[PDB]
């Protein structure tokens, strides 16, 4: 029901991205077939993570390999961090390491570039145009009011991003971080090794 | 006498606001800024351009000659024009393609004066494009140039202390 | 602005109210009746005493006059006017026009409601893909 | 469309029902009776912003209403300014 | 009622505006053209953009000896 | 309502369907209301228009809490007595590693419980009684078992005073809304008569019974239980029966004395608490003030007085209201109570006030982070409730035209500044670090920001710290060292396994954390300040206060019109503060262990839990997971099969609960509706659903179940991460 349902019977002729609707009825929100697509892409970024995660740990261990290790250490969740994820960042995290820089530096800086692009998703995602627009209403009383900043016209009026736009941008942001971190993670660890 | 002017918020009507107060409007501030564009246009710009170009010019030296990328230089260049002279170019045209916000295009010609202007309604534009040129043209010969009697000078200099 | 003070309505100063593009577009002042002088809430963080009239303060944007209005009819009176000013006087004349108090009849103005078809089954999709032969432009 | 969010219902009676909304709605047109017989989805809408305060109260009994114009003013924005 | 600094005093009075400064340092047209290329322009500014930026970038990098990264 | 009003039912209403807002819960069924009502069980729009009672309710709810603490902590003090650890530890302190608490062995449970002790299996504790505790001198397990029931006494009674209000026919307006005394009393004789009273039972009894404990014995080889009155021979040691003074005063001679006191400065050696003897004097020298002080006074009087030209007319009758807002006189308080808790969090770690802390590392940093989250969890609140003021509380307008009405006058202004403040910070307050990476990963240290590289050169030393210890040029007299041992000048010498306390000298890499705090403290506040200020009406909505401080969001128009409100400014302001505190914690322990927490060794060569790795390596913000998160935390992910294990075994859940929040934080609402019906359908086929219309979460409830989880997730994660890297080495 991109065509839509009870909470929306209508929900059509823009079917796709009409993100949001007024409050009341029950309270209505990310109920465009885009914002379910929008919502979908988190689990396509969670399957396509469990799956890939899996190969590698396996392979890794297989290569100077105990196999055993996955075998007891596939079994439970902790020590999926501890080894894998915690074993084998090893190397990368210092390419920086204070006593000077070792062979991979692109990767680890990418790997933190990885943790920022991600995190900075959240704004877009826990912010919701309302709060942003309003302080830009005060923050566009500056110039208009403050010297040597004045006369001076934007061609485009200041605004805060529409109410679909930022569900995207946090994402298309959540994604790079995320996909640029494993990018930098696996390589930054299947390269030294040990496997 | 009046507790602060004949006590008014703004020029007079309250309703625009700006809560005109010191640092908005004190006979003392206000004055430290009228050959310069804040209120009236002194002269048709062309000249304001370089006192603007130049003053802002020999700035951006110790910023990128004492805080430069691998700093405290042993080179003939810096102390230096160098990169900074490069910035006044990027700056100065980032500046021009804003004088495509106003074109409005004329020569009238008056740096010469008739009759105490008022501009009349200067507030807002009434700067044609053929104005904003002769400013950001003064800017180049204000930027690049104002970058040299910075380095030209030996720095006789004062030590941290 | 001294040489003419027209004023009826009484703030003192604020950071609030209109900044430049009220001059360059569309103006929006509201005016009213009053009895005996009372102290009021505002739009824009607060407040003032009225007395009388024109009683003709001007606002930023239309949401703001009406917004008092709710404001203005709790604590009461009948009479509130809101007009829209340009720079350059008139067209678009806002509360004046027929009657006021929407919830009356003289006339229709307006509105329809339906487009071409009624609420029932647009399960049916949008149709022909935009061509300038068939009535899809209202 | 340029403001097209249907709040229509069937009673379009407006007593202990709905009024709320910054300017947009003059209604009270009548249509040749419905009980209370003030009808329509709207008055002319090229004036104000995009609430859904428009229902919240007094039925629409199909869709709620909402954002959707797209084609968007500044005055219809809130900000230009 | 003697004291009051009888109209005290005024100014003329507490106006200011009507001539607070002679306006500007002489320099008349100590520049006038002087450098034209922004003083000429119609039309330019590409021209310049490829030039300035072509040197800055061109010599900005290449050579002489490394001094390398 | 009318089951049946007034005069003529004792008979209680249980039943017929029940209550709120007038189209009251419908009759006809719903779910949401079961979520309503726990929420907004008190708001006080509703119950009565007229304040009438509520002040008559909030005194009772207060009683309940005071009891409850009491129920608590009898519990605690129990636990502490009869699962002892304590008797054993005290002969034994600095060996012991202490528990109050034990499981029973059922199923797995008991990995948990691993030898703590004076020879018993335990869960190791990091709140210290056992340190509040040292003070009791008399000792033994069954008492604390009296102090315990003494607790349950205060409770039942300090809980039948809550019967003895609201429910009992009970009180009226004047009593609060004539204030005129109230601080008069409070601060005078309790604030005073406690600290005072505390003095009397802080040298009488405690001082002596640890004056000769700081040697050993097996207690009671030292202290009889009552022992301590008409008697006293024992005072004689610890000083004179005042021998011949009179009621202080002077015609007094000392050739050698001055009364107990005799100020300490620095720490005890062989119990490095700080002297147990400035502890009487200081509390005595408090109370007096309070004793004199709570003797003002009756009010507007002082507030209505001074005015200035910027300054505010409003200042005057700055609030007839104040006496009856409430929501405001709570909001103010929280800022203070709250901001007056995390000032504890310092004076604690840089000046311990209990015997055996510092040496005891883990049993006073737990503290310094618990006390730290309250001096924050209570501050964002201290804004919320002002927002709750700023919108509603008074019937009507008549606050008028002041100081406030002033502040608001500017408002797109006070918050216009504050904004730039933050982007100035942030750019000078975080990308600062990012330089390092981008250029130490580029790698050219010449030009980093390292404490060595960009030049200040090797001193921190002189600002205040160096003037502060160095203290007696002064009108200052006193005491061999500092007010706080850490300050730069002075001493090697503190303690017996271990280092407790040492200069801490900073430089840079204390410089810039100290600045991230600024920017973090500041953009926190921006959102709350602008939040509570723009409470009621805004440039985006005027018709803005009209239901709510809560309402979800006004509506899709105006572009966004979503977040706005101020529940939500107190929703995105928590979101920050969780950092504000979460990174201040991250600061202290990485310092306090990278430097300070110690060991002493022959010839005193200090061995910091980490040889100052901080040096050149916090400055890199990867070093913050090279040296932190990936370095320490190796104790969390090694912790399995042990005793503490419940941390490693939490650290996955709650490191799960957090990563469940986003689902609640990041999602629509008519979505889980649209879903909740597919469900509701399948339900009807078998005939198994409709009754009590199952409904999705109340736009803002959904936000309530963000946040709250994001915090009890993201937080206990470290509560685990921590207790797991001080227990065991450190
Ligand atoms: C000294 C002050 C104290 C007091 C007396 C109050 C009193 C009040 N607050 Mg309040 N508040 C405070 C501090 C205080 N607050 C602080 C510090 C904050 C910042 C977080 C807030 C933020 C706040 C908000 C946003 C609101 C209130 C509201 C209210 C009113 C509603 C009370 C209610 O229904 O309970 C609410 C409690 C519940 C519904 C219980 C749910 C608690 C959950 C979240 C559990 C917490 C996590 C915990 C770890 C779980 C237990 C463990 C579990 C895992 C087993 C009431 C007048 C509300 C109002 O509308 O005003 C009229 C509004 O909601 N407060
Ligand atoms: C890591 C995070 C990410 C970043 C960078 C920011 C940044 C900011 N948030 Mg924010 N926020 C985030 C995640 C983030 N947030 C999340 C996840 C939430 C909720 C879950 C929020 C909730 C929130 C609220 C409620 C508020 C903010 C505000 C702010 C601004 C504070 C002022 C400031 O110091 O900015 C400037 C500094 C930075 C953004 C950090 C430095 C950036 C570095 C990398 C330098 C890059 C510049 C350089 C020239 C790049 C050019 C190179 C070229 C190739 C492009 C700032 C823009 C507040 C605000 O606007 O107040 C002013 C407002 O209070 N945030
Ligand atoms: C050591 C460094 C390097 C050198 C050689 C200089 C040299 C100079 N700077 Mg300078 N500057 C530097 C780094 C450096 N700067 C850095 C890193 C910054 C950071 C913004 C600045 C910011 C700065 C400003 C804002 C100004 C200068 C000014 C000046 C010039 C005027 C000297 C003076 O004090 O007026 C002598 C005054 C009288 C005789 C009267 C002088 C040529 C200007 C100036 O100093 O004028 C007062 C202008 O004030 N600098
Ligand atoms: C501060 C808090 C509070 C908390 C969280 C606890 C928690 C606990 N108490 Mg406890 N207790 C409390 C107050 C508390 N008590 C008070 C006020 C008293 C005095 C009446 C007691 C008297 C008490 C006894 C006698 C026992 C406990 C025991 C326990 C443990 C058994 C779990 C249980 O009660 O259900 C199941 C558990 C750790 C039990 C224990 O320690 O054995 C493992 C023991 O049964 N408590
Ligand atoms: C408010 C406080 C607290 C309380 C309840 C007491 C109570 C007592 N003190 Mg006392 N005391 C206190 C604080 C307190 N003290 C402090 C802070 C100091 C030192 C600064 C002392 C120094 C002190 C001495 C030297 C003595 C007492 C004695 C006594 C007992 C009888 C005399 C008396 O003080 O009051 C009742 C008043 C009269 C009898 C008159 C009585 C049990 C005396 C005692 O042992 O019994 C007679 C005597 O030994 N006190
Ligand atoms: C807006 C109002 C009115 C005005 C015009 C002033 C003006 C001033 N006050 Mg002030 N003040 C006022 C109302 C006012 N006050 C009120 C109502 C109070 C009570 C709330 C005060 C309490 C106060 C204090 C405590 C101080 C001032 C000071 C000052 C002076 C700043 C120092 C300076 O510039 O010289 C310095 C210039 C040099 C070249 C050196 C300045 C003349 C300060 C002062 O006494 O002068 C330093 C002092 O800090 N005021
Ligand atoms: C008439 C009379 C009298 C009176 C008596 C009495 C009754 C008294 C008292 C005393 C008192 C009345 C005291 C009090 C004290 C108090 C205090 C001492 C306080 C406390 C508290 C606490 C301890 C808390 C803590 C905490 C904190 C910090 C915060 C939160 C948390 C907790 C809770 C932990 C006399 C004697 C003259 C005698 C004659 C007769
Ligand atoms: C099958 C099933 C199930 C399931 C289970 C599970 C799977 C679980 C989980 C869980 C998880 C996976 C996670 C969780 C977590 C939780 C928590 C976590 C809670 C709580 C808490 C607390 C108590 C806390 C406290 C604190 C404080 C005090 C403050 C802050 C810090 C902390 C946090 C420490 C059951 C049996 C149930 C039911 C039936 C069916
Ligand atoms: C902590 C604790 C506890 C305990 C309790 C008790 C049993 C007690 C105490 C404490 C106390 C209970 C104290 C008291 C004190 C007292 C005082 C501090 C007094 C003041 C002073 C006086 C005695 C008086 C004086 C005077 C003069 C100057 C002369 C004549 C007049 C008069 C009398 C005013 C409980 C159980 C809760 C539990 C938990 C822990
Ligand atoms: C950690 C990097 C070092 C940078 C700071 C160094 C400057 C100060 C010198 C060392 C600081 C440590 O201070 C320490 O000095 C000595 C170690 O040599 C020890 O000296 C101690 O041991 C001996 C026993 O009688 C005697 O030499 C001293 O009387 C006594 O104070 C102390 O345990 C401590 O007071
Ligand atoms: C910050 C923020 C804003 C404010 C909008 C901002 C801050 C835009 C700021 C512009 C940034 C600084 C531009 C930098 C981006 C560059 C990569 C340039 C883009 C180039 C392109 C053409 C791709 C919103 O409007 C918003 C709306 C709805 C939900 C969340 C949010 C939200 O989190
Ligand atoms: C997942 C999610 C939901 C769906 C979440 C739901 C429906 C949680 C409610 C589930 C309740 C708690 C189950 C209650 C049933 C049991 C208590 C009944 C049986 C009693 C027992 C003995 C088990 C929302 O409703 C929502 C709303 C707004 C923003 C985001 C979200 C959001 O992210
Ligand atoms: S809201 Fe609906 S029901 Fe009410 S008057 Fe309008 S159209 Fe009719
Ligand atoms: S909110 Fe909606 S219904 Fe109300 S005026 Fe605006 S467009 Fe019309
Ligand atoms: S932004 Fe919020 S209020 Fe607006 S439509 Fe979306 S969910 Fe509703």
The string of DSSP letters for F298-320 reads: --HHHHTT---SSS-GGGTTTTS
**C121 CB-near residues (< 8 Å, 6+ apart):** none
- What domains sit in chain C, N to C, each tagged with a CATH number? 1-138 (3.30.1470.10)
Report the DSSP beta bridge partners of residue D18. Answer: none
Q: Where on the phi/psi map is residue F645: left (φ > 0), alpha (ψ -120 to 50), or beta? A: left
**D40 CB-near residues (< 8 Å, 6+ apart):** C110, C111, C112, C113, D8, D12, D27, D29, D31
Q: How far is CA F548 from CA A137, F36, F193, F472, F477, in A?
A: 21, 15, 44, 58, 58
Give the CA count within 13 Å in the CB-facing half-sphere of D76: 16
Burial class (CB in 10 A: 0-12, 13-18, 19+), A47: exposed
Going by C-alpha positions, the residue among F560, F569, F572 that lies closest to residue F534 is F569
Question: What would be the CATH architecture of the domain defined by B1-161?
Answer: Up-down Bundle (1.20)
Residues of B with CB under 8 A from a CB of C: 9-20, 124
Do residues A36 and A3 touch, judged by C-beta distance below 8 A? no
Q: Where on the phi/psi map is residue F46: left (φ > 0), alpha (ψ -120 to 50), or beta? A: beta
Q: Do A147 and B33 touch (CB under 8 A)?
A: yes
The answer to whether residue B47 neighbours chain E at the CB level (below 8 Å) is: yes
- Would the CA dihedral through A101, A102, A104, A110 be positive or negative? negative
Tell me the technique behind this structure.
Answer: X-ray
- The protein residue with its alpha carbon nearest to ligand 13, atom 4, reads D58
**N-term to C-term CA, chain C:** 47
- The first and second tokens of residue F704, run together, are 């309530």
Atom of ligand 3 nearest to the CA of B67: 17
CA of C20 vs chain A CAs: smallest distance (Å)? 7
Range of the domain at E22: 1-69
Tally Cβ neighbours within 10 Å of residue F93.
19
Domain ranges, ordered by start, for chain D: 1-81
Atom of ligand 7 nearest to the CA of F198: 18
CA of C130 vs chain A CAs: smallest distance (Å)? 13
What is the number of the ligand closest to the CA of A21? 15
**CATH 2.60.40.420 is the classification of domain D1-81:** no
Going by C-alpha positions, the residue among F134, F110, F133, F106 that lies closest to residue F123 is F110
**Which CATH number characterizes residue F400's domain?**
1.20.1130.10
Q: Ligand 1 within 6 A of F378 CB?
A: yes
**N-term to C-term CA, chain E:** 85
DSSP per-residue codes, A128-155: TTHHHHHHHHHHTSHHHHSTTS-S---S
Please tell me the total count of domains within chain E. Answer: 1
Ligand 10 centroid distance, CA of F492 (Å) = 6
Q: Give the distance, in angstroms, between the CA of residue F174 and the centroid of all CA atoms in the same chain.
A: 34
Between strands F292-293 and F99-101, the pairing is: unpaired
Do residues A26 and F31 touch, judged by C-beta distance below 8 A? no
Q: Ligand 11 within 6 A of A171 CB?
A: no
Q: Give the distance, in angstroms, between the CA of residue F426 and the centroid of all CA atoms in the same chain.
A: 27
Do residues F432 and F518 touch, judged by C-beta distance below 8 A? no
- The first and second tokens of residue F434, run together, are 């990012």
- Could you say which residues from 4 to 23 on chain C have a Cβ atom under 8 Å away from some Cβ of chain F? 12-16
Say which residue the tokens 């404001």 belong to: C71
Distance CA F410, CA F397 (A): 19
Q: Give the distance, in angstroms, between the CA of residue D80 and the centroid of all CA atoms in the same chain.
A: 23
Task: State the angle between helix axes of A130-139 and F419-427 in degrees (0 to 180), rounded to the nearest 10.
Answer: 100
- The first and second tokens of residue B51, run together, are 């006192």
Tally Cβ neighbours within 10 Å of residue F152.
16
Distance CA F462, CA F473 (A): 16
B/e letters for F461-480, b = 16+ CB within 10 Å, e = fewer, are eeeebbeebbbeeeeeeebe
**N-term to C-term CA, chain D:** 24
Most B CBs within 10 A among C5, C7, C12, C13, hence the mutation to make, goes to C13
DSSP per-residue codes, F611-625: SS-GGGTSTTSSHII
Going by C-alpha positions, the residue among F208, F265, F271 that lies closest to residue F234 is F208
Q: How far is CA F150 from CA F75, F144, F163, in A?
A: 11, 9, 20
Q: Number of H helices and number of E strands within chain C?
A: 1, 4
In the three-class reduction of DSSP (H, G, I as helix; E, B as strand; rest coil), residue C81 is classed as: strand
Distance CA A19, CA A162 (A): 10
Distance CA F98, CA F118 (A): 9
The secondary structure of residue F124, as a DSSP letter, is: E
Distance CA F342, CA F369 (A): 9
Give, for F15, the enclosing helix (H) or strand (E): none
The secondary structure of residue E13, as a DSSP letter, is: S
What is the number of the ligand closest to the CA of F377? 1
Domain ranges, ordered by start, for chain B: 1-161
In the three-class reduction of DSSP (H, G, I as helix; E, B as strand; rest coil), residue F101 is classed as: strand
Q: How far is CA F651 from CA F368, F624, F714, in A?
A: 20, 19, 10
Ligand 14 centroid distance, CA of D66 (Å) = 8
Q: How far is CA F325 from CA A173, F40, F330, F385, F395, in A?
A: 45, 18, 9, 11, 11
Distance CA A43, CA A174 (A): 12
Q: Do C19 and A141 touch (CB under 8 A)?
A: yes
In the three-class reduction of DSSP (H, G, I as helix; E, B as strand; rest coil), residue C48 is classed as: strand
Report the DSSP beta bridge partners of residue F99. Answer: F124
Do residues F254 and F242 touch, judged by C-beta distance below 8 A? no
Distance CA D51, CA D45 (A): 12
- Supply φ then ψ for residue C39, to 5 degrees: -110, 125
Tally Cβ neighbours within 10 Å of residue F679.
12
Please tell me the total count of domains within chain F. Answer: 1
In the three-class reduction of DSSP (H, G, I as helix; E, B as strand; rest coil), residue F127 is classed as: coil
Most C CBs within 10 A among A10, A11, A12, hence the mutation to make, goes to A12
Preceding-residue numbers of gaps in chain A (C–N over 2.5 Å): none
Distance CA F152, CA F69 (A): 10
CA of D65 vs chain C CAs: smallest distance (Å)? 13
Contacts B33 to A, Cβ<8 Å: 147
Do residues F717 and F658 touch, judged by C-beta distance below 8 A? yes
Detail the DSSP E strand segments found in F486-528: none
Give, for F100, the enclosing helix (H) or strand (E): strand F99-101
Resolution, Å (one decimal): 3.3
Angle at F500 between CA F495 and CA F501, to 5 degrees: 115
Q: Ligand 12 within 6 A of F112 CB?
A: no
Do residues F324 and F176 touch, judged by C-beta distance below 8 A? yes
Atom of ligand 8 nearest to the CA of F650: 18
Report the DSSP beta bridge partners of residue B3. Answer: B5
Give the CA count within 13 Å in the CB-facing half-sphere of C43: 26
Say which residue the tokens 């009397």 belong to: F200
Going by C-alpha positions, the residue among F297, F63, F285 that lies closest to residue F192 is F285
Do residues F490 and F482 touch, judged by C-beta distance below 8 A? yes
Do residues A10 and D6 touch, judged by C-beta distance below 8 A? yes
């Amino acid at each position: 029901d991109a065509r839509g349902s009870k909470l929306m019977p209508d929900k059509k002729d823009f079917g796709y991205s009409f993100p949001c609707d007024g409050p009341g009825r029950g309270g209505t929100c990310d109920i465009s077939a885009w914002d379910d697509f929008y919502l979908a892409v988190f689990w396509m970024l969670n399957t396509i993570g469990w799956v890939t995660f899996y190969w590698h740990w396996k392979h890794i261990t297989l290569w100077r390999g105990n196999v055993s290790q996955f075998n007891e250490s596939s079994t439970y969740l902790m020590g999926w961090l501890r080894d894998y994820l915690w074993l084998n960042s090893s190397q990368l995290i210092n390419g920086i390491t204070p006593l000077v820089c070792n062979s991979l530096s692109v990767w680890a800086w990418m790997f933190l570039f990885g943790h920022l692009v991600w995190a900075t998703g959240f704004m877009f995602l826990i912010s919701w145009r309302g709060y942003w627009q309003e302080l830009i209403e005060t923050l566009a009383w500056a110039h208009e009011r403050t010297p040597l900043a004045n006369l001076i016209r934007w061609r485009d009026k200041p605004v805060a991003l529409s109410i679909v736009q930022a569900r995207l941008v946090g994402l298309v942001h959540f994604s790079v971080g995320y996909i640029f971190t494993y990018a930098a993670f696996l390589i930054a660890s299947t390269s030294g090794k040990f496997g | 006498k009046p507790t602060y002017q004949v006590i008014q918020p703004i020029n007079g009507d309250p309703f625009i606001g700006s809560l005109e107060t010191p640092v908005t409007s004190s006979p003392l501030i206000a004055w430290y800024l009228s050959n310069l564009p804040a209120y009236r246009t002194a002269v048709s710009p062309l000249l304001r351009g370089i006192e603007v170009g130049l003053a802002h010019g020999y700035l951006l030296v110790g910023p990128f000659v004492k805080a430069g990328p691998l700093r405290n230089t042993e080179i003939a260049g810096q102390a230096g024009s160098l990169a900074a002279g490069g910035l006044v170019v990027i700056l100065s045209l980032c500046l021009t393609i804003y004088g495509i916000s106003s074109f409005n295009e004329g020569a009238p010609s008056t740096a010469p004066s008739l009759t105490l202007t008022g501009r009349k309604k200067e507030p807002d534009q009434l700067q044609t494009a053929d104005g904003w040129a002769k400013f950001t043209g003064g800017f180049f010969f204000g930027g690049i140039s104002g970058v040299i009697w910075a380095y030209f000078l030996l720095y006789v200099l004062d030590l941290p202390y | 602005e001294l040489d003419p003070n027209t004023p009826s309505p009484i703030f003192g100063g604020s950071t609030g109210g209109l900044l430049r593009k009220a001059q360059v577009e569309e103006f929006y002042v509201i005016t009213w009746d009053s009895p005996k002088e009372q102290i009021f809430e505002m739009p824009t963080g607060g407040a003032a005493i009225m007395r009388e009239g024109p009683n003709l303060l001007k606002l930023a944007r239309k949401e703001q006059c009406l917004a008092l209005g709710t404001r203005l009819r709790s604590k009461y009176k009948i009479k509130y006017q809101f007009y829209r000013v340009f720079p350059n006087g008139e067209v678009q004349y806002l509360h004046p026009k027929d009657g006021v108090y929407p919830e009356k009849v003289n006339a229709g103005r307006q509105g329809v409601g339906q487009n071409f078809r009624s609420i029932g089954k647009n399960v049916s999709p949008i149709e022909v893909k935009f061509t300038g032969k068939q009535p899809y432009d209202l | 469309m340029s403001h097209s969010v249907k709040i229509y219902d069937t009673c379009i009676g407006c007593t202990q029902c709905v009024r709320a909304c910054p300017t947009d709605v003059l209604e009270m047109i009548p249509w040749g009776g419905c009980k209370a017989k003030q009808i329509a989805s709207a008055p002319r809408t090229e004036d104000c912003v995009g609430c859904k305060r428009c229902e919240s109260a007094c039925p629409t009994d199909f869709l709620s209403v909402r954002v959707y114009l797209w084609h968007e003013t500044t005055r219809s924005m809130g900000l230009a300014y | 009622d003697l004291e009051d600094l009888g109209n005290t005093t005024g100014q003329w009075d507490s106006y200011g505006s009507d001539a607070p400064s002679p306006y500007n340092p002489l320099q008349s047209k100590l520049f006038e053209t002087f450098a034209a290329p922004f003083t000429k322009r119609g039309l330019l500014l590409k021209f310049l953009i490829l030039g300035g930026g072509s040197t800055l970038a061109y010599l900005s990098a290449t050579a002489s000896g490394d001094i390398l990264p | 309502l009318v089951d049946r009003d007034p005069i003529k039912t004792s008979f209680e209403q249980w039943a017929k369907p029940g209550h709120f807002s007038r189209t009251i819960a419908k009759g006809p069924d719903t779910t949401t209301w079961i979520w309503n009502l726990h929420a907004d069980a008190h708001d006080f729009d509703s119950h009565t228009s007229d304040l009438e009672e509520i002040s008559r309710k909030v005194f009772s709810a207060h009683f309940g809490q005071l009891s409850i603490i009491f129920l608590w902590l009898s519990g605690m003090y129990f636990h502490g007595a009869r699962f002892s650890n304590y008797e054993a530890w005290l002969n034994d302190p600095t060996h012991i590693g202490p528990s109050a608490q034990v499981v029973w062995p059922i199923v797995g449970q008991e990995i948990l419980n691993g030898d703590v002790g004076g020879g018993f299996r335990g869960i190791q504790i990091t709140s210290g009684f056992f340190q509040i505790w040292r003070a009791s001198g008399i000792t033994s397990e069954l008492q604390l078992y009296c102090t315990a029931i003494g607790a349950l006494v205060f409770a039942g009674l300090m809980l039948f005073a809550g019967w003895f209000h609201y429910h009992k026919a009970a009180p009226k307006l004047a009593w609060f809304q004539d204030v005129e005394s109230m601080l008069n009393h409070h601060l005078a004789g309790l604030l005073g008569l406690g600290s005072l009273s505390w003095a009397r039972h802080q040298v009488h009894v405690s001082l002596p019974i640890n004056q000769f404990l700081n040697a050993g014995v097996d207690p009671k080889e030292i202290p009889l239980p009552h022992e301590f009155i008409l008697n006293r021979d024992l005072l004689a040691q610890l000083y004179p029966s005042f021998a011949e003074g009179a009621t202080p005063f002077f015609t007094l001679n000392w050739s050698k004395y001055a009364d107990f006191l005799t100020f300490r400065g620095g720490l005890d050696p062989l119990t490095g608490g700080l002297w147990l003897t400035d502890i009487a004097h200081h509390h005595l020298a408090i109370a007096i003030l309070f004793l004199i002080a709570g003797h003002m006074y009756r009010i507007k009087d002082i507030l209505e007085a001074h005015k200035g030209p910027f300054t505010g007319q409003g200042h005057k009758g700055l609030y007839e209201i104040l006496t009856t807002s409430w929501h405001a006189q709570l909001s103010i308080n929280l800022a203070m109570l709250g901001s007056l808790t995390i000032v504890v969090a310092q004076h604690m770690y840089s000046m311990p006030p209990y015997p055996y802390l510092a040496t005891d590392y883990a049993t006073q940093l737990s503290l310094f982070t618990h006390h730290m989250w309250i001096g924050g969890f209570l501050i964002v609140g201290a804004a919320a409730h002002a927002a709750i003021f700023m919108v509603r509380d008074y019937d009507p307008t008549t606050r008028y035209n002041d100081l406030l009405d002033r502040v608001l006058r500017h408002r797109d202004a006070i918050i216009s500044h504050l904004n730039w403040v933050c982007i100035f910070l942030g750019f000078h307050s975080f990308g600062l670090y990012i330089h390092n990476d981008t250029m130490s990963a580029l790698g050219r240290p010449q030009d980093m920001f390292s404490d060595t590289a960009i030049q200040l050169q090797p001193v921190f030393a002189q600002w205040i710290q160096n003037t502060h210890a160095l203290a007696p040029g002064t009108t200052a007299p006193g005491a061999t060292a500092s007010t706080s041992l850490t300050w730069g000048g002075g001493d090697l010498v503190a303690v017996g396994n271990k280092v407790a306390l040492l200069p801490i000298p900073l430089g840079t890499a204390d410089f810039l954390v100290h600045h991230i705090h600024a920017f973090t403290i500041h953009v926190t506040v921006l959102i709350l300040l602008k939040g509570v200020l723009f409470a009621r009406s805004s440039r985006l909505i005027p018709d803005k206060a009209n239901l709510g401080f809560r309402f979800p969001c006004d509506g899709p128009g105006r572009g966004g019109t979503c977040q706005v409100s101020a529940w939500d400014h107190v929703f995105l302001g928590l979101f920050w503060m969780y950092n504000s505190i979460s990174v201040v914690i991250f600061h202290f322990s990485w310092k306090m262990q990278s430097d300070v927490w110690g060991t002493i060794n022959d010839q005193g060569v200090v061995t910091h839990i980490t040889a100052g790795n901080f040096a050149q390596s916090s400055i890199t913000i990867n070093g913050w997971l090279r040296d932190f998160l990936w370095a320490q935390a190796s104790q969390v992910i090694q912790s399995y099969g042990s005793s503490l294990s419940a941390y490693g075994l939490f650290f996955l859940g709650a490191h799960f609960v957090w990563a469940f929040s986003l689902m609640f934080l990041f999602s629509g609402r008519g979505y889980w509706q649209e879903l909740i019906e597919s469900i509701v359908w399948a339900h009807n086929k078998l005939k198994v659903a409709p009754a009590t219309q199952p409904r999705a979460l109340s736009i803002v409830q959904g936000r309530a179940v963000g946040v709250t989880h994001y915090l009890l997730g993201g937080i206990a994660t470290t509560w685990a991460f921590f207790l797991a890297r001080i227990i065991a080495v450190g």
